[PDB]
From a paper:
SIases, classified as glycoside hydrolase family 13 (GH13) enzymes, catalyze the isomerization of sucrose to produce isomaltulose and trehalulose as primary products and D-glucose and D-fructose as by-products. NX-5 (named NX-5 in this work) that predominantly produces isomaltulose (~87%). Similar to other GH13 family enzymes, the NX-5 molecule is composed of three domains: the N-domain (residues 42-145 and 216-520), the sub-domain (residues 146-215), and the C-domain (residues 521-600). Among them, residues Asp102, His145, Arg239, His368, Asp369, Glu428, and Arg456 are responsible for sucrose binding and residues Asp241 (the nucleophile) and Glu295 (the acid catalyst) are crucial for sucrose hydrolysis for PalI, MutB, and SmuA.
To investigate the mechanism of substrate binding and sucrose isomerization, we determined the crystal structure of the inactive E295Q mutant in complex with the substrate sucrose at 1.70 Å resolution. In the structure, the sucrose molecule was deeply bound in the active site with the glucosyl ring at subsite -1 and fructosyl moiety at subsite +1. The glucosyl ring of sucrose interacts with a water molecule and eight residues of NX-5 (Asp102, His145, Arg239, Asp241, Gln295, His368, Asp369, and Arg456) via a hydrogen-bond network as well as through π-π stacking with Tyr105 and Phe205. Therefore, the fructosyl moiety of sucrose has fewer interactions with the active site pocket, which should allow it to exit easily after sucrose hydrolysis and undergo tautomerization resulting in trehalulose production. Upon sucrose binding, the phenyl rings of Phe297 and Phe321 were forced to move away from the substrate. Substrate binding also pushed the side chain of Arg325 towards Arg328. Glu428 is involved in a 2.39 Å hydrogen bond to the 6’-OH of the fructosyl moiety, which induces the O6’-C6’ bond to rotate 98.9°. The conformation of the 10-residue loop (residues 330-339) in NX-5 was remarkably different from that of the corresponding loop (residues 289-297) in MutB.
Author numbering: 42 to 600
Amino acid sequence: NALPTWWKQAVFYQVYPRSFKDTNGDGIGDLNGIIENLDYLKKLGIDAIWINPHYDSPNTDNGYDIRDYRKIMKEYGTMEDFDRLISEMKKRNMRLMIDIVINHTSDQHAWFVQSKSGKNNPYRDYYFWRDGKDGHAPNNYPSFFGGSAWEKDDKSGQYYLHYFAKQQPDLNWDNPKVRQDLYDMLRFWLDKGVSGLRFDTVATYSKIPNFPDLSQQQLKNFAEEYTKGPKIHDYVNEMNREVLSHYDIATAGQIFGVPLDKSIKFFDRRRNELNIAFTFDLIRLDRDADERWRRKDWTLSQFRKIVDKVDQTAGEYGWNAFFLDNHDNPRAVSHFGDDRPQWREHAAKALATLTLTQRATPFIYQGSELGMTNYPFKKIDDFDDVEVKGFWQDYVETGKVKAEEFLQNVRQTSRDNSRTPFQWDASKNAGFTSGTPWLKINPNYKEINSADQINNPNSVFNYYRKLINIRHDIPALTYGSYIDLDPDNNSVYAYTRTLGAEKYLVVINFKEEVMHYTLPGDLSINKVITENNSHTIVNKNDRQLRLEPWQSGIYKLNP
Ligand SMILES: OC[C@H]1O[C@@](CO)(O[C@H]2O[C@H](CO)[C@@H](O)[C@H](O)[C@H]2O)[C@@H](O)[C@@H]1O
Ligand SMILES: [Ca+2]
Protein backbone atom coordinates (compact mmCIF):
# COMPACT_ATOMS: atom_id res chain seq x y z
CA ASN A 1 0.00 0.00 0.00
CA ALA A 2 1.70 3.22 -1.31
CA LEU A 3 1.56 6.40 0.96
CA PRO A 4 1.68 8.96 -1.84
CA THR A 5 3.21 12.39 -1.26
CA TRP A 6 4.12 15.38 -3.48
CA TRP A 7 7.80 14.61 -2.98
CA LYS A 8 7.63 10.99 -3.89
CA GLN A 9 5.99 11.93 -7.19
CA ALA A 10 8.05 15.02 -7.90
CA VAL A 11 10.78 15.31 -10.50
CA PHE A 12 13.52 17.52 -9.11
CA TYR A 13 16.08 19.50 -11.07
CA GLN A 14 19.38 20.44 -9.44
CA VAL A 15 20.79 23.94 -10.23
CA TYR A 16 24.44 24.66 -9.37
CA PRO A 17 24.00 28.46 -9.33
CA ARG A 18 27.69 29.22 -10.05
CA SER A 19 27.36 27.44 -13.41
CA PHE A 20 23.74 28.01 -14.45
CA LYS A 21 23.36 31.51 -15.90
CA ASP A 22 25.42 34.68 -15.35
CA THR A 23 23.37 37.89 -15.78
CA ASN A 24 25.92 40.58 -14.93
CA GLY A 25 29.05 39.61 -16.80
CA ASP A 26 31.35 38.59 -13.98
CA GLY A 27 31.51 35.01 -15.36
CA ILE A 28 29.72 33.42 -12.31
CA GLY A 29 26.16 32.45 -12.42
CA ASP A 30 23.67 34.12 -10.08
CA LEU A 31 20.09 34.08 -8.63
CA ASN A 32 18.70 36.41 -11.35
CA GLY A 33 20.06 33.89 -13.90
CA ILE A 34 17.93 31.21 -12.25
CA ILE A 35 14.84 33.48 -12.18
CA GLU A 36 15.23 34.35 -15.83
CA ASN A 37 15.15 30.68 -16.80
CA LEU A 38 12.27 29.37 -14.72
CA ASP A 39 10.04 29.22 -17.78
CA TYR A 40 12.59 26.96 -19.41
CA LEU A 41 12.46 24.50 -16.39
CA LYS A 42 8.69 24.73 -16.42
CA LYS A 43 8.62 23.70 -20.12
CA LEU A 44 10.93 20.76 -19.26
CA GLY A 45 8.18 19.80 -16.68
CA ILE A 46 10.29 20.06 -13.42
CA ASP A 47 8.21 20.69 -10.32
CA ALA A 48 10.96 21.23 -7.72
CA ILE A 49 14.44 22.68 -7.88
CA TRP A 50 17.28 21.91 -5.42
CA ILE A 51 19.91 24.74 -5.44
CA ASN A 52 23.43 24.17 -4.22
CA PRO A 53 24.52 26.51 -1.33
CA HIS A 54 23.57 30.15 -1.83
CA TYR A 55 25.04 31.67 1.40
CA ASP A 56 27.82 34.13 2.12
CA SER A 57 31.02 32.11 1.51
CA PRO A 58 34.73 32.73 0.70
CA ASN A 59 34.32 29.88 -1.81
CA THR A 60 37.21 27.62 -0.91
CA ASP A 61 34.64 24.88 -1.73
CA ASN A 62 32.20 26.89 -3.90
CA GLY A 63 29.59 27.68 -1.25
CA TYR A 64 30.11 24.66 0.99
CA ASP A 65 32.34 26.79 3.40
CA ILE A 66 29.70 29.16 4.81
CA ARG A 67 30.74 32.43 6.47
CA ASP A 68 27.17 33.57 7.33
CA TYR A 69 24.10 31.35 7.11
CA ARG A 70 21.75 34.29 6.98
CA LYS A 71 23.35 36.30 4.14
CA ILE A 72 23.18 35.58 0.36
CA MET A 73 26.54 34.81 -1.33
CA LYS A 74 27.79 38.11 -2.78
CA GLU A 75 28.39 36.58 -6.22
CA TYR A 76 24.78 35.27 -6.36
CA GLY A 77 22.92 38.50 -5.54
CA THR A 78 20.94 39.91 -2.60
CA MET A 79 18.26 38.77 -0.19
CA GLU A 80 15.74 40.53 -2.45
CA ASP A 81 16.86 38.34 -5.32
CA PHE A 82 16.44 35.26 -3.14
CA ASP A 83 12.91 36.36 -2.11
CA ARG A 84 12.11 37.02 -5.81
CA LEU A 85 13.22 33.48 -6.69
CA ILE A 86 10.84 32.05 -4.09
CA SER A 87 8.04 34.31 -5.28
CA GLU A 88 8.54 33.55 -9.03
CA MET A 89 8.76 29.77 -8.44
CA LYS A 90 5.57 30.07 -6.33
CA LYS A 91 3.84 31.80 -9.25
CA ARG A 92 4.80 28.80 -11.41
CA ASN A 93 3.87 26.22 -8.84
CA MET A 94 7.46 25.07 -8.31
CA ARG A 95 8.93 24.15 -4.89
CA LEU A 96 12.43 25.11 -3.76
CA MET A 97 14.89 22.91 -1.93
CA ILE A 98 17.96 24.49 -0.37
CA ASP A 99 21.25 22.96 0.70
CA ILE A 100 21.87 22.72 4.44
CA VAL A 101 25.59 22.55 5.25
CA ILE A 102 25.86 22.12 9.04
CA ASN A 103 28.61 19.56 9.48
CA HIS A 104 31.06 22.52 9.27
CA THR A 105 31.26 26.25 8.67
CA SER A 106 33.88 28.45 7.02
CA ASP A 107 36.88 29.29 9.22
CA GLN A 108 35.71 32.88 8.63
CA HIS A 109 32.35 32.31 10.32
CA ALA A 110 31.84 34.59 13.43
CA TRP A 111 31.58 31.44 15.51
CA PHE A 112 34.94 30.02 14.57
CA VAL A 113 36.63 33.50 14.66
CA GLN A 114 35.54 33.61 18.30
CA SER A 115 36.35 29.97 19.02
CA LYS A 116 39.95 30.15 17.82
CA SER A 117 40.53 33.24 20.21
CA GLY A 118 41.42 31.12 23.23
CA LYS A 119 40.37 28.15 25.33
CA ASN A 120 38.24 30.63 27.35
CA ASN A 121 36.09 31.91 24.63
CA PRO A 122 32.37 30.97 25.03
CA TYR A 123 32.49 29.62 21.44
CA ARG A 124 35.47 27.53 22.12
CA ASP A 125 33.51 24.27 22.17
CA TYR A 126 31.38 25.13 19.06
CA TYR A 127 34.24 23.26 17.26
CA PHE A 128 36.60 20.43 18.11
CA TRP A 129 39.93 21.42 19.59
CA ARG A 130 42.43 18.84 20.78
CA ASP A 131 46.05 18.54 21.87
CA GLY A 132 48.70 17.25 19.58
CA LYS A 133 50.49 14.01 20.34
CA ASP A 134 54.38 14.02 20.19
CA GLY A 135 54.21 17.35 18.31
CA HIS A 136 52.00 15.86 15.59
CA ALA A 137 48.24 15.72 15.02
CA PRO A 138 45.91 14.38 17.77
CA ASN A 139 45.41 11.25 15.68
CA ASN A 140 45.82 9.75 12.20
CA TYR A 141 42.49 11.05 10.75
CA PRO A 142 42.83 12.03 7.04
CA SER A 143 40.78 14.80 5.38
CA PHE A 144 38.65 14.21 2.31
CA PHE A 145 40.36 17.23 0.74
CA GLY A 146 43.98 16.17 1.41
CA GLY A 147 46.43 15.83 4.28
CA SER A 148 45.47 15.53 7.92
CA ALA A 149 41.97 16.31 9.32
CA TRP A 150 43.67 18.36 12.09
CA GLU A 151 44.94 21.90 11.69
CA LYS A 152 47.26 23.40 14.40
CA ASP A 153 46.36 26.91 15.58
CA ASP A 154 49.41 28.89 16.88
CA LYS A 155 47.39 31.15 19.17
CA SER A 156 46.33 28.17 21.32
CA GLY A 157 48.68 25.39 20.37
CA GLN A 158 45.71 23.07 19.89
CA TYR A 159 44.55 21.39 16.57
CA TYR A 160 41.03 21.85 15.23
CA LEU A 161 39.15 19.18 13.35
CA HIS A 162 38.23 19.52 9.61
CA TYR A 163 37.05 16.47 7.77
CA PHE A 164 36.94 18.66 4.58
CA ALA A 165 39.18 21.69 3.78
CA LYS A 166 41.22 23.40 6.49
CA GLN A 167 38.78 26.26 5.80
CA GLN A 168 35.82 24.08 6.85
CA PRO A 169 36.18 23.31 10.60
CA ASP A 170 33.61 20.80 11.90
CA LEU A 171 30.87 22.04 14.26
CA ASN A 172 30.54 20.30 17.60
CA TRP A 173 27.07 18.72 17.60
CA ASP A 174 27.73 17.29 21.07
CA ASN A 175 27.24 20.81 22.42
CA PRO A 176 23.53 21.44 22.75
CA LYS A 177 24.07 25.14 22.23
CA VAL A 178 25.43 24.48 18.72
CA ARG A 179 22.39 22.37 17.84
CA GLN A 180 20.08 25.13 19.15
CA ASP A 181 21.83 27.79 17.14
CA LEU A 182 21.61 25.57 13.97
CA TYR A 183 17.94 25.10 14.65
CA ASP A 184 17.31 28.87 14.76
CA MET A 185 19.22 29.12 11.48
CA LEU A 186 16.99 26.53 9.86
CA ARG A 187 13.83 28.30 11.06
CA PHE A 188 15.13 31.46 9.46
CA TRP A 189 15.06 29.84 6.00
CA LEU A 190 12.01 27.76 6.60
CA ASP A 191 10.01 30.82 7.66
CA LYS A 192 10.61 32.18 4.10
CA GLY A 193 8.55 29.36 2.63
CA VAL A 194 11.27 27.04 1.31
CA SER A 195 9.77 23.61 0.62
CA GLY A 196 12.72 21.29 0.99
CA LEU A 197 16.11 20.84 2.64
CA ARG A 198 19.02 18.75 1.41
CA PHE A 199 21.40 17.90 4.31
CA ASP A 200 25.03 17.87 3.14
CA THR A 201 27.06 14.96 4.65
CA VAL A 202 24.30 14.37 7.23
CA ALA A 203 25.80 11.11 8.61
CA THR A 204 29.02 12.72 9.92
CA TYR A 205 27.54 15.13 12.62
CA SER A 206 28.37 12.79 15.50
CA LYS A 207 32.10 12.49 16.20
CA ILE A 208 33.67 9.34 17.73
CA PRO A 209 34.25 9.76 21.53
CA ASN A 210 37.91 10.31 22.41
CA PHE A 211 39.05 10.36 18.79
CA PRO A 212 41.00 7.01 18.69
CA ASP A 213 43.44 6.42 15.83
CA LEU A 214 42.01 4.68 12.82
CA SER A 215 43.40 1.24 12.13
CA GLN A 216 45.22 0.28 8.90
CA GLN A 217 42.11 -1.08 7.24
CA GLN A 218 40.02 1.93 8.44
CA LEU A 219 42.39 4.49 6.91
CA LYS A 220 41.53 2.93 3.52
CA ASN A 221 37.84 3.54 4.09
CA PHE A 222 37.74 6.46 6.48
CA ALA A 223 34.49 7.95 5.10
CA GLU A 224 32.62 4.97 6.56
CA GLU A 225 34.28 5.34 9.95
CA TYR A 226 33.30 8.97 10.20
CA THR A 227 29.65 7.88 9.95
CA LYS A 228 30.01 5.66 13.04
CA GLY A 229 29.29 8.39 15.67
CA PRO A 230 27.17 6.97 18.49
CA LYS A 231 24.64 9.86 18.55
CA ILE A 232 23.89 10.56 14.87
CA HIS A 233 20.31 9.26 14.99
CA ASP A 234 19.67 10.99 18.24
CA TYR A 235 20.73 14.31 16.66
CA VAL A 236 18.85 13.80 13.37
CA ASN A 237 15.67 12.74 15.29
CA GLU A 238 16.07 15.71 17.62
CA MET A 239 16.29 18.07 14.62
CA ASN A 240 13.14 16.40 13.22
CA ARG A 241 11.28 16.80 16.52
CA GLU A 242 12.40 20.43 17.20
CA VAL A 243 12.31 21.83 13.65
CA LEU A 244 11.58 19.62 10.68
CA SER A 245 8.25 18.25 11.85
CA HIS A 246 6.99 21.81 12.51
CA TYR A 247 7.06 22.74 8.85
CA ASP A 248 5.62 21.27 5.65
CA ILE A 249 8.81 20.14 3.83
CA ALA A 250 10.63 17.32 2.08
CA THR A 251 14.12 16.52 3.51
CA ALA A 252 16.85 14.72 1.70
CA GLY A 253 19.88 13.33 3.45
CA GLN A 254 23.25 12.92 1.72
CA ILE A 255 24.48 9.82 3.61
CA PHE A 256 27.91 9.69 2.15
CA GLY A 257 29.94 6.74 3.55
CA VAL A 258 27.00 5.04 5.26
CA PRO A 259 26.81 1.30 4.37
CA LEU A 260 23.64 0.59 2.48
CA ASP A 261 22.25 -1.75 5.18
CA LYS A 262 22.49 1.19 7.72
CA SER A 263 20.85 3.78 5.50
CA ILE A 264 17.21 2.87 6.35
CA LYS A 265 17.55 4.23 9.92
CA PHE A 266 17.73 7.77 8.46
CA PHE A 267 14.66 7.48 6.13
CA ASP A 268 12.21 4.94 7.60
CA ARG A 269 9.10 7.17 8.01
CA ARG A 270 8.50 5.63 11.41
CA ARG A 271 11.83 6.92 12.80
CA ASN A 272 10.98 10.61 12.22
CA GLU A 273 14.31 11.45 10.77
CA LEU A 274 14.54 12.31 7.03
CA ASN A 275 12.36 11.71 3.95
CA ILE A 276 14.58 11.03 0.86
CA ALA A 277 17.75 8.94 0.72
CA PHE A 278 20.75 10.15 -1.37
CA THR A 279 22.88 6.98 -1.51
CA PHE A 280 26.20 6.60 -3.27
CA ASP A 281 26.50 2.87 -4.00
CA LEU A 282 25.40 3.31 -7.61
CA ILE A 283 27.08 6.51 -8.58
CA ARG A 284 30.44 5.32 -7.15
CA LEU A 285 30.22 1.73 -8.37
CA ASP A 286 33.33 2.23 -10.56
CA ARG A 287 35.33 4.15 -7.89
CA ASP A 288 38.12 2.93 -5.61
CA ALA A 289 37.09 3.27 -1.92
CA ASP A 290 40.73 3.98 -0.88
CA GLU A 291 42.28 6.03 -3.74
CA ARG A 292 38.97 7.87 -4.16
CA TRP A 293 39.97 9.64 -7.38
CA ARG A 294 40.62 6.38 -9.30
CA ARG A 295 38.05 4.69 -11.52
CA LYS A 296 37.90 1.05 -12.63
CA ASP A 297 36.02 -1.04 -15.13
CA TRP A 298 32.42 -1.87 -14.42
CA THR A 299 29.68 -3.89 -15.93
CA LEU A 300 25.92 -3.60 -16.45
CA SER A 301 25.36 -6.64 -14.24
CA GLN A 302 27.23 -4.80 -11.41
CA PHE A 303 25.22 -1.63 -12.02
CA ARG A 304 21.79 -3.44 -12.02
CA LYS A 305 22.64 -5.39 -8.88
CA ILE A 306 23.24 -2.16 -7.05
CA VAL A 307 19.94 -0.69 -8.34
CA ASP A 308 18.04 -3.68 -6.99
CA LYS A 309 19.86 -3.68 -3.58
CA VAL A 310 19.21 0.04 -3.16
CA ASP A 311 15.54 -0.43 -4.10
CA GLN A 312 15.07 -3.33 -1.67
CA THR A 313 16.81 -1.46 1.19
CA ALA A 314 14.27 1.33 1.00
CA GLY A 315 11.57 -1.31 1.37
CA GLU A 316 8.11 -0.47 2.48
CA TYR A 317 8.94 2.43 4.83
CA GLY A 318 11.90 4.40 3.36
CA TRP A 319 12.21 6.28 0.08
CA ASN A 320 15.06 6.76 -2.37
CA ALA A 321 16.15 9.55 -4.63
CA PHE A 322 17.58 8.44 -7.94
CA PHE A 323 20.30 10.26 -9.78
CA LEU A 324 23.10 9.44 -12.14
CA ASP A 325 25.18 12.60 -11.74
CA ASN A 326 25.34 15.76 -9.69
CA HIS A 327 27.83 18.58 -8.89
CA ASP A 328 30.23 16.01 -7.30
CA ASN A 329 30.41 13.44 -10.05
CA PRO A 330 31.04 13.18 -13.85
CA ARG A 331 28.17 13.70 -16.31
CA ALA A 332 25.85 10.74 -16.74
CA VAL A 333 26.21 10.31 -20.49
CA SER A 334 29.98 10.13 -20.22
CA HIS A 335 30.03 8.03 -17.04
CA PHE A 336 27.25 5.47 -17.76
CA GLY A 337 26.59 6.00 -21.48
CA ASP A 338 28.65 6.52 -24.63
CA ASP A 339 29.42 10.17 -25.15
CA ARG A 340 30.87 9.84 -28.72
CA PRO A 341 28.89 11.77 -31.38
CA GLN A 342 27.33 8.62 -32.91
CA TRP A 343 25.81 7.54 -29.61
CA ARG A 344 25.51 10.45 -27.29
CA GLU A 345 21.88 11.46 -27.97
CA HIS A 346 20.67 7.89 -27.89
CA ALA A 347 22.53 6.95 -24.71
CA ALA A 348 21.35 10.22 -23.06
CA LYS A 349 17.78 9.27 -23.90
CA ALA A 350 18.35 5.71 -22.64
CA LEU A 351 19.71 7.00 -19.25
CA ALA A 352 16.79 9.48 -19.03
CA THR A 353 14.39 6.56 -19.50
CA LEU A 354 16.20 4.67 -16.70
CA THR A 355 16.06 7.63 -14.35
CA LEU A 356 12.46 8.53 -14.92
CA THR A 357 11.26 4.89 -14.45
CA GLN A 358 12.69 4.22 -10.97
CA ARG A 359 10.73 3.72 -7.74
CA ALA A 360 12.35 6.87 -6.33
CA THR A 361 12.25 10.62 -6.62
CA PRO A 362 14.36 11.42 -9.74
CA PHE A 363 16.83 14.27 -9.64
CA ILE A 364 17.93 15.74 -13.02
CA TYR A 365 21.17 17.62 -12.81
CA GLN A 366 21.39 20.79 -14.84
CA GLY A 367 22.49 20.15 -18.46
CA SER A 368 21.80 16.37 -18.32
CA GLU A 369 18.52 17.19 -20.18
CA LEU A 370 20.67 18.34 -23.14
CA GLY A 371 23.10 15.39 -22.97
CA MET A 372 26.04 17.59 -21.78
CA THR A 373 29.27 15.57 -21.46
CA ASN A 374 32.50 15.52 -19.48
CA TYR A 375 34.95 18.25 -20.34
CA PRO A 376 38.34 17.56 -22.04
CA PHE A 377 40.67 18.54 -19.15
CA LYS A 378 44.32 18.26 -20.25
CA LYS A 379 46.72 19.63 -17.60
CA ILE A 380 46.43 19.71 -13.85
CA ASP A 381 45.94 23.56 -13.89
CA ASP A 382 42.83 23.12 -16.16
CA PHE A 383 40.93 22.00 -13.03
CA ASP A 384 39.43 24.48 -10.33
CA ASP A 385 38.31 22.13 -7.62
CA VAL A 386 39.91 22.06 -4.14
CA GLU A 387 39.36 18.31 -4.03
CA VAL A 388 41.39 17.45 -7.12
CA LYS A 389 44.27 19.64 -5.82
CA GLY A 390 44.11 17.68 -2.49
CA PHE A 391 44.33 14.33 -4.36
CA TRP A 392 47.20 15.67 -6.46
CA GLN A 393 49.05 16.70 -3.32
CA ASP A 394 48.52 13.41 -1.56
CA TYR A 395 49.24 11.04 -4.46
CA VAL A 396 51.29 12.84 -7.18
CA GLU A 397 53.42 15.33 -5.17
CA THR A 398 54.40 12.41 -2.87
CA GLY A 399 55.59 10.47 -5.97
CA LYS A 400 53.17 7.67 -5.19
CA VAL A 401 51.30 7.89 -8.63
CA LYS A 402 52.63 9.16 -11.95
CA ALA A 403 51.09 12.54 -12.94
CA GLU A 404 49.88 11.19 -16.24
CA GLU A 405 48.13 8.14 -14.67
CA PHE A 406 46.51 10.42 -12.05
CA LEU A 407 45.27 12.66 -14.86
CA GLN A 408 43.90 9.74 -16.92
CA ASN A 409 41.68 8.97 -13.91
CA VAL A 410 40.68 12.45 -12.77
CA ARG A 411 39.77 13.52 -16.31
CA GLN A 412 37.07 10.89 -15.95
CA THR A 413 36.22 11.35 -12.20
CA SER A 414 36.69 15.01 -11.37
CA ARG A 415 33.79 17.07 -9.94
CA ASP A 416 34.67 19.81 -12.37
CA ASN A 417 33.24 17.76 -15.24
CA SER A 418 29.76 18.61 -13.84
CA ARG A 419 30.62 22.25 -13.22
CA THR A 420 31.41 23.69 -16.65
CA PRO A 421 28.82 26.35 -17.44
CA PHE A 422 25.33 25.46 -18.74
CA GLN A 423 25.19 25.52 -22.56
CA TRP A 424 22.23 27.75 -23.39
CA ASP A 425 22.84 28.48 -27.04
CA ALA A 426 25.41 28.55 -29.81
CA SER A 427 26.49 32.22 -29.22
CA LYS A 428 29.81 33.19 -27.66
CA ASN A 429 30.35 31.21 -24.38
CA ALA A 430 27.13 29.27 -25.12
CA GLY A 431 25.16 32.35 -23.99
CA PHE A 432 26.07 31.59 -20.33
CA THR A 433 27.91 34.94 -19.77
CA SER A 434 28.71 38.24 -21.54
CA GLY A 435 32.15 38.10 -19.73
CA THR A 436 34.76 35.36 -19.17
CA PRO A 437 33.34 32.26 -17.55
CA TRP A 438 34.76 31.17 -14.21
CA LEU A 439 35.42 27.73 -15.66
CA LYS A 440 35.89 27.15 -19.38
CA ILE A 441 32.84 26.07 -21.43
CA ASN A 442 32.99 22.80 -23.27
CA PRO A 443 33.66 23.51 -26.99
CA ASN A 444 30.92 21.01 -27.77
CA TYR A 445 28.41 23.75 -26.95
CA LYS A 446 27.98 24.50 -30.66
CA GLU A 447 26.54 21.00 -30.98
CA ILE A 448 24.93 20.63 -27.51
CA ASN A 449 22.82 23.61 -26.39
CA SER A 450 19.32 24.31 -25.21
CA ALA A 451 18.39 26.63 -28.10
CA ASP A 452 19.03 23.83 -30.60
CA GLN A 453 16.84 21.35 -28.61
CA ILE A 454 13.81 23.13 -27.01
CA ASN A 455 11.79 23.24 -30.27
CA ASN A 456 13.20 20.10 -31.92
CA PRO A 457 10.79 17.24 -31.12
CA ASN A 458 13.58 14.70 -31.54
CA SER A 459 15.97 16.34 -29.05
CA VAL A 460 17.27 15.00 -25.71
CA PHE A 461 15.44 17.87 -23.98
CA ASN A 462 12.09 16.90 -25.50
CA TYR A 463 12.62 13.24 -24.79
CA TYR A 464 13.11 14.10 -21.05
CA ARG A 465 9.94 16.29 -21.37
CA LYS A 466 8.05 13.35 -22.83
CA LEU A 467 9.29 10.90 -20.13
CA ILE A 468 8.34 13.32 -17.34
CA ASN A 469 4.81 13.53 -18.77
CA ILE A 470 4.67 9.75 -19.05
CA ARG A 471 5.78 9.23 -15.47
CA HIS A 472 3.13 11.77 -14.22
CA ASP A 473 0.46 9.84 -16.17
CA ILE A 474 1.33 6.26 -15.19
CA PRO A 475 1.26 5.63 -11.37
CA ALA A 476 3.14 2.35 -11.64
CA LEU A 477 6.25 4.27 -12.89
CA THR A 478 6.41 6.09 -9.55
CA TYR A 479 5.08 3.62 -6.97
CA GLY A 480 5.10 0.25 -8.71
CA SER A 481 7.34 -2.49 -7.36
CA TYR A 482 10.57 -3.17 -9.24
CA ILE A 483 11.78 -6.51 -10.57
CA ASP A 484 14.95 -6.98 -12.61
CA LEU A 485 14.38 -9.70 -15.29
CA ASP A 486 18.04 -10.90 -15.16
CA PRO A 487 20.59 -9.31 -12.79
CA ASP A 488 23.48 -11.11 -14.61
CA ASN A 489 22.78 -9.86 -18.14
CA ASN A 490 25.61 -7.39 -19.24
CA SER A 491 23.88 -6.40 -22.52
CA VAL A 492 20.18 -5.62 -22.09
CA TYR A 493 18.79 -4.00 -18.96
CA ALA A 494 15.16 -5.09 -18.55
CA TYR A 495 12.92 -4.61 -15.51
CA THR A 496 9.26 -4.33 -14.64
CA ARG A 497 7.27 -1.90 -12.64
CA THR A 498 4.03 -3.22 -11.24
CA LEU A 499 0.99 -1.90 -9.38
CA GLY A 500 -1.66 -4.59 -9.09
CA ALA A 501 -2.67 -5.63 -12.64
CA GLU A 502 -0.83 -2.74 -14.19
CA LYS A 503 2.63 -3.87 -15.28
CA TYR A 504 5.16 -2.01 -17.37
CA LEU A 505 8.54 -3.14 -18.85
CA VAL A 506 11.54 -0.97 -19.37
CA VAL A 507 14.21 -2.25 -21.84
CA ILE A 508 17.54 -0.61 -22.65
CA ASN A 509 20.17 -1.98 -24.94
CA PHE A 510 23.65 -0.96 -23.47
CA LYS A 511 25.41 -2.59 -26.51
CA GLU A 512 26.36 -0.81 -29.74
CA GLU A 513 25.13 -3.75 -31.73
CA VAL A 514 21.71 -5.04 -32.51
CA MET A 515 20.45 -7.30 -29.73
CA HIS A 516 17.51 -9.70 -29.94
CA TYR A 517 15.83 -10.03 -26.65
CA THR A 518 13.16 -12.62 -25.96
CA LEU A 519 10.88 -11.96 -22.98
CA PRO A 520 10.80 -14.46 -20.07
CA GLY A 521 7.90 -16.78 -19.15
CA ASP A 522 4.47 -15.68 -20.36
CA LEU A 523 5.25 -11.97 -20.64
CA SER A 524 3.99 -10.25 -23.84
CA ILE A 525 3.52 -6.68 -24.96
CA ASN A 526 0.18 -4.82 -24.76
CA LYS A 527 1.34 -1.35 -25.89
CA VAL A 528 4.43 0.70 -26.67
CA ILE A 529 4.48 3.63 -24.33
CA THR A 530 7.67 5.19 -25.83
CA GLU A 531 10.86 4.12 -27.64
CA ASN A 532 13.98 5.83 -28.85
CA ASN A 533 16.05 4.55 -31.75
CA SER A 534 13.75 1.76 -32.69
CA HIS A 535 13.48 0.40 -36.24
CA THR A 536 11.42 -2.81 -35.75
CA ILE A 537 7.72 -2.24 -35.03
CA VAL A 538 6.15 -3.85 -31.94
CA ASN A 539 2.69 -5.38 -32.31
CA LYS A 540 0.18 -6.61 -29.81
CA ASN A 541 1.35 -9.82 -28.07
CA ASP A 542 4.98 -9.54 -29.26
CA ARG A 543 7.22 -11.69 -27.00
CA GLN A 544 10.52 -10.53 -28.44
CA LEU A 545 12.14 -7.18 -29.17
CA ARG A 546 14.86 -6.59 -31.77
CA LEU A 547 16.82 -3.78 -30.17
CA GLU A 548 18.89 -1.32 -32.16
CA PRO A 549 22.16 -0.16 -30.55
CA TRP A 550 21.32 2.10 -27.54
CA GLN A 551 17.63 1.55 -28.14
CA SER A 552 15.47 2.26 -25.03
CA GLY A 553 11.75 1.86 -24.40
CA ILE A 554 8.77 1.54 -22.02
CA TYR A 555 6.03 -1.02 -22.79
CA LYS A 556 2.86 -1.96 -21.02
CA LEU A 557 2.61 -5.76 -20.62
CA ASN A 558 -0.51 -7.93 -21.09
CA PRO A 559 -2.17 -9.11 -17.88
O1 LIG B 1 33.91 14.92 -3.49
C1 LIG B 1 33.04 15.48 -2.47
C2 LIG B 1 33.02 14.72 -1.15
O2 LIG B 1 32.23 15.38 -0.17
C3 LIG B 1 30.85 14.91 -0.11
C4 LIG B 1 30.53 14.62 1.38
O3 LIG B 1 31.40 13.48 1.63
O4 LIG B 1 30.08 15.94 -0.73
C5 LIG B 1 29.47 17.00 0.02
O5 LIG B 1 30.31 17.60 1.03
C6 LIG B 1 31.40 18.42 0.58
C7 LIG B 1 31.84 19.32 1.78
O6 LIG B 1 30.72 20.19 2.17
C8 LIG B 1 31.04 19.29 -0.65
O7 LIG B 1 32.32 19.74 -1.24
C9 LIG B 1 30.25 18.44 -1.69
O8 LIG B 1 29.99 19.28 -2.82
C10 LIG B 1 28.96 18.04 -1.00
O9 LIG B 1 28.01 17.38 -1.91
C11 LIG B 1 30.80 13.66 -0.98
O10 LIG B 1 30.11 13.94 -2.23
C12 LIG B 1 32.25 13.44 -1.41
O11 LIG B 1 32.83 12.51 -0.44
CA1 LIG C 1 27.11 36.91 -12.18
